[PDB]
Amino acid sequence: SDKIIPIAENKEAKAKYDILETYEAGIVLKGSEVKSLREKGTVSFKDSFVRIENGEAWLYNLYIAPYKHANHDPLRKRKLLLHKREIMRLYGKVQEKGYTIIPLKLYWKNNKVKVLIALAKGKKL
RNA sequence: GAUUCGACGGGGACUUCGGUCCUCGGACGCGGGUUCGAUUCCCGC
């Protein structure tokens, strides 16, 4: 029914944030990026975060390795396809409780690239 | 093998206007075009 293939998970985040809610992806990717995401290409979530600007949702520091396609800043503010009520929802929480929104993984789901997003807290340790 | 569930942009529908939707574009090097329909066909970079 729903075939999916892992691309990259964020280990540096499973022992740091305590997940409160998870939401599913939607990212307007640039051509090249998709190819170099299939071609295998490296990707990291180091110091990557999500911000809600003009009513939109943005993934801020995701390194997507480029490829021989001839331009494509590997970091780009990438936009997320996520449903207004979902943004507004997330947005609220961030204020109200000071929470934070971070990326948990990248994966394929019907040859559509997607990024899992959570609304998290801190751990105190 | 419709299809980013969604954001945004372009069209459009119903509404006690607060709502509720449809559709088209876009991510498979870059711009097109063929076709009902094209990451896989065609035409330059």
Swiss-Prot record:
Gene Ontology molecular functions: RNA binding
Q: GO cellular component annotations, sorted alphabetically?
A: cytosol
Keyword annotations for this protein, in alphabetical order, are: Cytoplasm, RNA-binding
Q: Name the domain of life this protein comes from.
A: Bacteria
Localization recorded for this chain is: Cytoplasm
Primary role? Required for rescue of stalled ribosomes mediated by trans-translation. Binds to transfer-messenger RNA (tmRNA), required for stable association of tmRNA with ribosomes. tmRNA and SmpB together mimic tRNA shape, replacing the anticodon stem-loop with SmpB. tmRNA is encoded by the ssrA gene; the 2 termini fold to resemble tRNA(Ala) and it encodes a 'tag peptide', a short internal open reading frame. During trans-translation Ala-aminoacylated tmRNA acts like a tRNA, entering the A-site of stalled ribosomes, displacing the stalled mRNA.
Query: What protein family does this chain belong to?
Result: Belongs to the SmpB family.
Name this protein carries in UniProt: SsrA-binding protein
Q: Which stretch of the full sequence is covered here?
A: 4 to 131 of 157
